[PDB]
From a paper:
Somatic angiotensin-converting enzyme (sACE), a key regulator of blood pressure and electrolyte fluid homeostasis, cleaves the vasoactive angiotensin-I, bradykinin, and a number of other physiologically relevant peptides. sACE consists of two homologous and catalytically active N- and C-domains, which display marked differences in substrate specificities and chloride activation. There is also a smaller testicular form of ACE (tACE), which is transcribed from the same gene and identical to the C-domain of ACE. The active site for both domains is contained within the large central groove, with the signature HEXXH zinc-binding motif residing on the α15 helix. ACE activity is dependent on chloride ions, with the degree of dependence being substrate-specific.
A high resolution data set was collected for the D465T mutant. The native Asp465 side chain is stabilized by a salt bridge with Arg468 as well as hydrogen bonds with the main chain of Tyr520 and Ile521. Although it did not disrupt the local secondary α-helical structure, mutation to Thr465 resulted in reorientation of the side chain with a 60° rotation that allows it to interact with Ser461 and Ile521, thus losing the interaction with Arg468. Interestingly, this also led to a change in rotamer conformation of Trp469, which went from a water-mediated interaction with Asp465 to a hydrogen bond with Arg221. This created a new pocket that permitted the presence of a malonate molecule (a component of the crystallization buffer; data not shown). The malonic acid is coordinating with the same Arg221 on one side and mimicking the interactions previously made by Asp465 on the other side, including the salt bridge with Arg468 and hydrogen bonds with Tyr520 and Ile521. Noticeably, loop Ser434–Ser439 was visible for the first time in a C-domain crystal structure with clear electron density observed for this flexible loop region. Given that Asp465 is one of very few contacts between helices α23 and α20, its role is most likely in stabilization of the C-terminal end of helix α23. The maximum specific activity in the presence of chloride (SAmax) and the activity at 0 mm NaCl as a percentage of maximal activity (%SAmax) for D465T with both HHL and Z-FHL were lower than those of the C-domain. The Thr in this position is capable of fewer potential hydrogen bonds, resulting in more structural movement that affects the C-terminal carboxylate coordinating Tyr520 (lowering of SAmax).
Numbering used by the authors: 40 to 625
The structure:
């Protein structure tokens, strides 16, 4: 009865802390030191954690959950009934675990080489080419080269990955892996909700897209941009065209109001990765939120090692499930983009610290998007010309309506452009998992969706054997993407709420929440819930209402919408890409 179920949950929490902590240390050791030995130890620890998951999952499934009264225990038990990959028979489990490691390793160590020349890694070398080169053919070399080396090499693994991850899902009572993932949101309306939200951002995105396309035409030439077609995917300042702010220089609304070069300013002033994380730590504590522990500074990997070594560079935050040991692993570069990423990662660390006294089963965000949003919310304030001037990374840009529209454009290039991208990635993998896209059409459907949602085209026709989704980290790493779409919507809701909590008046985009304890309190109360309640409860605690809504994001960018509509109107832009079949001729 109730006593047996309460006891079970207590034993699960005790044992899980121990085994999860062991697994986390082995996983960290491989991620920060990719070798045969650390791979071997990780794959061994995979079997140890599966043994535990199987043991407790099997006992959990013997409880009739709806006979149980207490709702917190009902909830933990239902969750422990999901064995995830541990539902697989032993041979398939070992195969699956090896496939995942091989995909991660392949992505993380791929390089692109000039013939008889230097070989470039994604971080920082190719990322730097995409962000700074203004030459069509140099950008193409990097963009195609990365797909040829990373994308194509992932293809041999992906169909077996999909088979095994779906098999695990069905064994746990889902129809496929995507169903399994989406279930974390506990929102039956989720599909419709995401479509509605995507549609509300259309006026802003289509106008931003049309304006950017016009500027690219100006720079790259009339023979290379079709003003009524999709934009070549290598021209947007980012390897995946997911965020476009690195081409700010090409699209400045008011060039008479130029901004300080922020990378130059950071470097000349001796900014370092540690300083970047220290500044993030300060922002959190200014809100009354928790500082990271001394152990964090000892054990974190805040830059790429120099001791001849392979690591997974992609930025991540790590909970070691003992309530003390939290770490970030990031190949940090000294620039503004990575300052924002550092805040994002520190938001994950904050969430870990806030829910650390919950049972480990409930040590997650209210939904995964909440976990992604916390750091980004603070980074919105960090990004204001006010805050950046106070860091001496910008001159005084206060006052002018020119600098103001410029600032909004700079933010839009990341925040608005990302909405269709995150939607695309979500939809593609959804349809791979549900079987609507097979290995016969992985790449063709990727590009159909790239066109349909983002209005982008590949600069070079794709060929058989290309697997461009493989060249995006989250695909081989099997990290869900819907979280980021959700994050980008809700972070503006949170910003709007925290700003009114802090007593900001005037346009939302001028808000800076630095030092607001009232704002800190809203966040903390929500984060302390972890995964203990339906996510609308945490949304309510932060915002005073329970829905996901694009209205805050639209309010923030309202003055840019007006400016873009006027600008595009006078140039006669035809929004969208009615000439959707257009691709580059040369
Ligand atoms: C349903 O059950 C939950 C969970 O209860 C806890 O875990 C069980 C498996 C058993 O081990 C229980 O002995 C244990 O209480 C109940 O939620 C818990 O309620 C208590 C009492 O309100 C909360 O106590 C707080 O604890 C913090 C310190 O951690 C103090 O600072 C607070 O002042 C306060 O005393 C406890 O946090 C809470 N735990 C969780 C995980 O939610 C719940 O009350 C119960 N429902 C009903 C209707 O009885
Ligand atoms: C890297 O890996 C090996 C185990 O393969 C280990 O002996 C060594 O201590 C590790 N090096 C670092 C810098 O962690
Ligand atoms: Cl691509
Ligand atoms: Cl997700
Ligand atoms: Zn994140």
């Amino acid at each position: 009865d109730e006593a047996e179920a309460s006891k079970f949950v207590e034993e699960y929490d005790r044992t899980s802390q121990v085994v999860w902590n062991e697994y986390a240390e082995a996983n960290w050791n491989y991620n920060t030191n990719i070798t045969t030995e650390t791979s071997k130890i990780l794959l061994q620890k995979n079997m140890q954690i599966a043994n535990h998951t199987l043991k407790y999952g099997t006992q959990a499934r013997k409880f009739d959950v709806n006979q149980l009264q207490n709702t917190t225990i009902k909830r933990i038990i239902k969750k422990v009934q999901d064995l995830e990959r541990a539902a697989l028979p032993a041979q398939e489990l070992e195969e699956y675990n090896k496939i995942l490691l091989d995909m991660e390793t392949t992505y993380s160590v791929a390089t692109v080489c000039h013939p008889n020349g230097s070989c470039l890694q994604l971080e920082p070398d190719l990322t730097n080419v995409m962000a700074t080169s203004r030459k069509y053919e140099d950008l193409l070399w990097a963009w195609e080269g990365w797909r040829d080396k990373a994308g194509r090499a992932i293809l041999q693994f992906y169909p077996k990955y999909v088979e095994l991850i779906n098999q695990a899902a069905r064994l746990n009572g889902y129809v496929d892996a995507g169903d399994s993932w989406r279930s974390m949101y506990e929102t039956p309306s989720l599909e419709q909700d995401l479509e509605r939200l995507f549609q509300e951002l259309q006026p802003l995105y289509l106008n931003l897209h049309a304006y950017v396309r016009r500027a690219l035409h100006r720079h790259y030439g009339a023979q290379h941009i079709n003003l009524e077609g999709p934009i070549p995917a290598h021209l947007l300042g980012n390897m995946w065209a997911q965020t476009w702010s690195n081409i700010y220089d090409l699209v400045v609304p008011f060039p008479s109001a130029p901004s300080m070069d922020t990378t130059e300013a950071m470097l000349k002033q001796g900014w370092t990765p540690r300083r970047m994380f220290k500044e993030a730590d300060d922002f959190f504590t200014s809100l009354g939120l928790l500082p990271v522990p001394p152990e964090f500074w000892n054990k974190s990997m805040l830059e790429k090692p120099t001791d001849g070594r392979e690591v997974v560079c992609h930025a991540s935050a790590w909970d070691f499930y003992n309530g003390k040991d939290f770490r970030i692993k990031q190949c940090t570069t000294v620039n503004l983009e990575d300052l924002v990423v550092a805040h994002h990662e520190m938001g994950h660390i904050q969430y870990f610290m806030q829910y650390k006294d919950l049972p480990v089963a409930l040590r997650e965000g209210a939904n995964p998007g909440f976990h992604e949003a916390i750091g980004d919310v603070l980074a919105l304030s960090v990004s204001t010309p006010k805050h950046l001037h106070s860091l001496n990374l910008l001159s005084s840009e206060g006052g002018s309506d020119e600098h103001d529209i410029n600032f909004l454009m700079k933010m839009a290039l990341d925040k608005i452009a990302f909405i269709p991208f995150s939607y695309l990635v979500t939809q593609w993998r959804w349809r791979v998992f549900d079987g609507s896209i097979t290995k016969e059409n992985y790449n063709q459907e990727w590009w159909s969706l790239r066109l349909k949602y983002q209005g982008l085209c590949p600069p070079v026709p794709r060929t058989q054997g290309d697997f461009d989704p493989g060249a995006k980290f989250h695909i081989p790493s099997s990290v869900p993407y819907i979280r980021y779409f959700v994050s980008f919507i809700i972070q503006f809701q949170f910003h709007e709420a925290l700003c009114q909590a802090a007593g900001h008046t005037g346009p939302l985009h001028k808000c800076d929440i630095y030092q607001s304890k009232e704002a800190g309190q809203r966040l903390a109360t929500a984060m302390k819930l972890g995964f203990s309640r339906p996510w609308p409860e945490a949304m309510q605690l932060i915002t005073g209402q329970p829905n996901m809504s694009a209205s805050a994001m639209l309010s923030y960018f309202k003055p840019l919408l007006d400016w873009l509509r006027t600008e595009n109107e006078l140039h006669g832009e035809k929004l969208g890409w009615p000439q959707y079949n257009w691709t580059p001729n040369s």
